[PDB]
Amino acid sequence: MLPITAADDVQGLLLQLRGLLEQAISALASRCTKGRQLDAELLDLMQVPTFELAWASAELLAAERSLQAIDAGTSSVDRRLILVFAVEAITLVHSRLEAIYAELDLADGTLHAIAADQKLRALRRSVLSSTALHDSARLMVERPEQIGQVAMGDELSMIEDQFRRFAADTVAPLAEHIHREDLIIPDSLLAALRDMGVFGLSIPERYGGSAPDDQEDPLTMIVVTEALSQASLAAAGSLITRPEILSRALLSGGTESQKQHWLARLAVGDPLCAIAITEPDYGSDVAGLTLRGTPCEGGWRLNGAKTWCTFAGKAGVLMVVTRTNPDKSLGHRGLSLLLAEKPSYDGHEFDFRQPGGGSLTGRAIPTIGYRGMHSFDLSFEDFFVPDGNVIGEAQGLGKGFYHTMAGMTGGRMQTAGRASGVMRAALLAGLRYATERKVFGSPLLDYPLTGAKLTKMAARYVASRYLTYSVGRMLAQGEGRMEASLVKLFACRSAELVTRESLQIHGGMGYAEEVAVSRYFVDARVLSIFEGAEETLALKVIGRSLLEAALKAEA
Amino acid sequence: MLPITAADDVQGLLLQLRGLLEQAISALASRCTKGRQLDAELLDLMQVPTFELAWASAELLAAERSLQAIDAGTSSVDRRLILVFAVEAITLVHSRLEAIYAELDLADGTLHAIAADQKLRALRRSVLSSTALHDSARLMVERPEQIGQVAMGDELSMIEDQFRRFAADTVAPLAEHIHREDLIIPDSLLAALRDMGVFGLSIPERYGGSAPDDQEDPLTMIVVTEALSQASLAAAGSLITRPEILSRALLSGGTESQKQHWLARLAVGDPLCAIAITEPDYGSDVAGLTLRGTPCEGGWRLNGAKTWCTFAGKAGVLMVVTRTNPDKSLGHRGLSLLLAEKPSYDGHEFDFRQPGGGSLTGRAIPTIGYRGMHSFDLSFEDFFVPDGNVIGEAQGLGKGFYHTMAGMTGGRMQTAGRASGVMRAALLAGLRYATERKVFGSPLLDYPLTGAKLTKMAARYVASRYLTYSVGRMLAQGEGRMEASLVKLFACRSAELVTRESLQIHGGMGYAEEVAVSRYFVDARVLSIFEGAEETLALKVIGRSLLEAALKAEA
Numbered sequence A, B: 001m002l003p004i005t006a007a008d009d010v011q012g013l014l015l016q017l018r019g020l021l022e023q024a025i026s027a028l029a030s031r032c033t034k035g036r037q038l039d040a041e042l043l044d045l046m047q048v049p050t051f052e053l054a055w056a057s058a059e060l061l062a063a064e065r066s067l068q069a070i071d072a073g074t075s076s077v078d079r080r081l082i083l084v085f086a087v088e089a090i091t092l093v094h095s096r097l098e099a100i101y102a103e104l105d106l107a108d109g110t111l112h113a114i115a116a117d118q119k120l121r122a123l124r125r126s127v128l129s130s131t132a133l134h135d136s137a138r139l140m141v142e143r144p145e146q147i148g149q150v151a152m153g154d155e156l157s158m159i160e161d162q163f164r165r166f167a168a169d170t171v172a173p174l175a176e177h178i179h180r181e182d183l184i185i186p187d188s189l190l191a192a193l194r195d196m197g198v199f200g201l202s203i204p205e206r207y208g209g210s211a212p213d214d215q216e217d218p219l220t221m222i223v224v225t226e227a228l229s230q231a232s233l234a235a236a237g238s239l240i241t242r243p244e245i246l247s248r249a250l251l252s253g254g255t256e257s258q259k260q261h262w263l264a265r266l267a268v269g270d271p272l273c274a275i276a277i278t279e280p281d282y283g284s285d286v287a288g289l290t291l292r293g294t295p296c297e298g299g300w301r302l303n304g305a306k307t308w309c310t311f312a313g314k315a316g317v318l319m320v321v322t323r324t325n326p327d328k329s330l331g332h333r334g335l336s337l338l339l340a341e342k343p344s345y346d347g348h349e350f351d352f353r354q355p356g357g358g359s360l361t362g363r364a365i366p367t368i369g370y371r372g373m374h375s376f377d378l379s380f381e382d383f384f385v386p387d388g389n390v391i392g393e394a395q396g397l398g399k400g401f402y403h404t405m406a407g408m409t410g411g412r413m414q415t416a417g418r419a420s421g422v423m424r425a426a427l428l429a430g431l432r433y434a435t436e437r438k439v440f441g442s443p444l445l446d447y448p449l450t451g452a453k454l455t456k457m458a459a460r461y462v463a464s465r466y467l468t469y470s471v472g473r474m475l476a477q478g479e480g481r482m483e484a485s486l487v488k489l490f491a492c493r494s495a496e497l498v499t500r501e502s503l504q505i506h507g508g509m510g511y512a513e514e515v516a517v518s519r520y521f522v523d524a525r526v527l528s529i530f531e532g533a534e535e536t537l538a539l540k541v542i543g544r545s546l547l548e549a550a551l552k553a554e555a
Ligand SMILES: C[C@@H](CC(=O)O)C(=O)SCCNC(=O)CCNC(=O)[C@H](O)C(C)(C)COP(=O)(O)OP(=O)(O)OC[C@H]1O[C@@H](n2cnc3c(N)ncnc32)[C@H](O)[C@@H]1OP(=O)(O)O
Pocket: A238, A241, A245, A275, A277, A278, A283, A284, A285, A286, A287, A310, A332, A401, A402, A403, A405, A406, A408, A409, A411, A481, A530, A531, A532, A533, A536, A540, A541
């Protein structure tokens, strides 16, 4: 058993670190301001402490939200794992703050005090001891269903049970063959997911979805995403992502008739949709996209390329960020969202010739993982899009950036769920293998180094999941815009770490394509790149918001 | 330019950390001692601080050996990069010692003194500042040839130049297709490598190779390995590995007639060889292997399984660790090295029947990377091996564990070179992409976060390379047995970290199979698993040796 004082000691130390973190943010905010406003040039100059402060903030908030969750219903497993991560987070955040304080020339006496604190040393010796980590690992093997048991009502809990059963029965048997043969998602699996309601979780009931009309709770979308992603990230969990992004764009900027026509159809996968933002020369820099839209009678003709457009072959509609104004001096103000319609194709390339002479061609890009929808290089040549298919119609012209960003918040929240499911798959596989594999006379699980790795893996998984559900509740209340990107950043890198470590526990087995953890590892690597690359999120969403809020508070 | 006094400040801080690390090794050795001798049970109990002490020792030695190498000829790049890594290592090792000192219940007042040293804060602000890291990045782009330019000698530098030219012109254009189609290494490439001498670098001249007759200098082996590995880990850099292990085993335990017969043939690739140690139930635990050899007239019948046997299809001879003695409690003393001869096969499976009816079948194991040679599950069924193919003939029976371990010393040295070559490839790829890709109006290189990542990648590559060459010089003087495992552990994990970061710098491009860094990433993941998995080496070679040395010194 852990000391009875551990939770209080952890909370006190995290609050001390939060004070130091907030002091560094204000110090940095002053070094980035010129004339009462953040300065783009100084922000670029100060990227290194900005990046480190974004990561320190993610780890701090993961530890706090996890610790705040401990109540009378928390499982015995989770109580131990939450404290493990919180003690680790104390040292992680302290380490970053020492580097940040040095770079910003701040006094570090208080940081030295925290490191020499006798309570921190006692926590290392009790919560992070080799026997305590080993005991937590044995407890996980005894009751794996208690790992990450976040608070849900019975309804959400039964939705989880149904989708875990479906993912295990129907998705998991197909996951390896889809990856190794780079197959498009079978129609049978698409039909099943459609009838489970997987395309309408983000869409209000009044537009033919299943989300209640008066509210915006993402927790249902998150729980289904997690269950499906555990079985297959790309072939099941990621089918939710495109409707999430495009429903949010249509709700942000569509007219009533566009919301009525499109959202009802997207909810039943007819048509399936794909997101066409990224271009060969622009991915992080959405404001700079150049795919050209030129007005003709009754609509637009599009010319240029898109790339990495996932599911573009099978999709019947594309959400295309289009530069509709030739004046490049407008930046993002020259962008509009256009709905390009196309036939549905099952292959790795397609060549669609329109009536008026336009064309759209596509060729899939082979990837190390994330396989099953394909991601395509697209070429638009005088491709026609009618006026009606401009999201927002006439008033949507020049506002495509705002509606894209609205979609991205939902996408990143959902991507935290995707990372969570991949982590749970990797964790359970490592726990199972450690129990079954014998080395030097005993099950691998019985060795203290194995216990420590498994408990640290689980602690990170669990802290990521409690943070994910916390941000979901923030979004349900109209808050947490920045925090969706923070938990995306935290969970997606955590998926890399957890999958790497699970693979290692497997030994050579972890490297074989016939062993699922090899696939979880190459799949997880994409999570920190797409949907907002880690650095872009840390600098231009998380770091920017932290500094803006410090400026205002001290104005 | 960095401060002039930085080198002495860093040296003084590393010397303090070494003292604390040596005290912790003594403390741990006492904890593991029962009756004047290390106890297996206590060692198992204390795995966690053993693992952490092994890692801290590797980071310490990498920093020390790099610093010790700075002289008048050291490039301007390397003088910077070596200080970068050395300052990082001070904080890495200090951090590990905090965990170790708490776990062993040691007084930690001196660790607090080091963390609060004003010399350390000044090193952070001068050597690890955003501007100094960015400066080093731009200098690397101007002078890429200065990165990691270890003192070599004219003859060795010339050999490096020649193999780099060949690797760029002949191997690199083939590497993507071999990986993406899981192709056997093409014979045209094998023949060209054969005639460059790639199979005879560790075979003495008097036995038909190119190595010195009196000395055992591994630096030529390393430098060719690095250059080939930069172009392809599995299709070129790894062709040196099997002859390095087998020739070393034959030099250790073969009879004069076996050395004369086998080494001259191996040196020209007639036959190619493959190493058959690992079994389905045993990889780390070589002493436990159970493939069975039963005596018969004129030789041995082999029965059982091997697995992960790389290049087993194409190789005409397998070096097979065989349990020739029925008393399994002999552990390693019941093992012998038997040379199993077979036709050459280029496919993913093979079925060989001897004229007497004995059988050897093989089926390749598909992997996420390291593709080209294939790794096979092998089944031996009454497979005959003549008396003359026991390494050592009669006197080699029961001695095969010793000769295998001797082989693995050279293998792990060679594998540190393989890791070095992959790191150089990933680093140069990341440097190039950062100069070419523009984001938000400027080349990616111009952003301080990019400079900091590139410079930290390069400082780790360089410290690993200077350590690799230092250990090679130790092997040349009959020392460095344990350090071969230590530098393999350090360099192989470092390849994971460098390739993950290089891929991140490429963004989505890094995930495409038509982009080399995606391949370097999945290849580098193998390095910390095979040739002695990181945990096995940390615990049973590095940690054990450190603890044994501390016992012997206190008696
Ligand atoms: C489908 C998935 C793959 C898969 O799963 O298969 C994918 O991969 S799919 C592609 C994902 N692609 C990205 O992830 C793009 C990442 N890159 C960005 O996201 C932005 O480009 C960054 C963060 C760089 C900032 O760009 P930035 O600095 O240039 O723009 P900014 O922040 O300064 O603001 C400009 C104006 O938009 C207003 N604005 C800002 N945020 C919001 C918001 N949330 N809602 C409404 N308005 C907003 C702002 O208030 C300004 O308004 P105004 O000043 O004009 O009035």
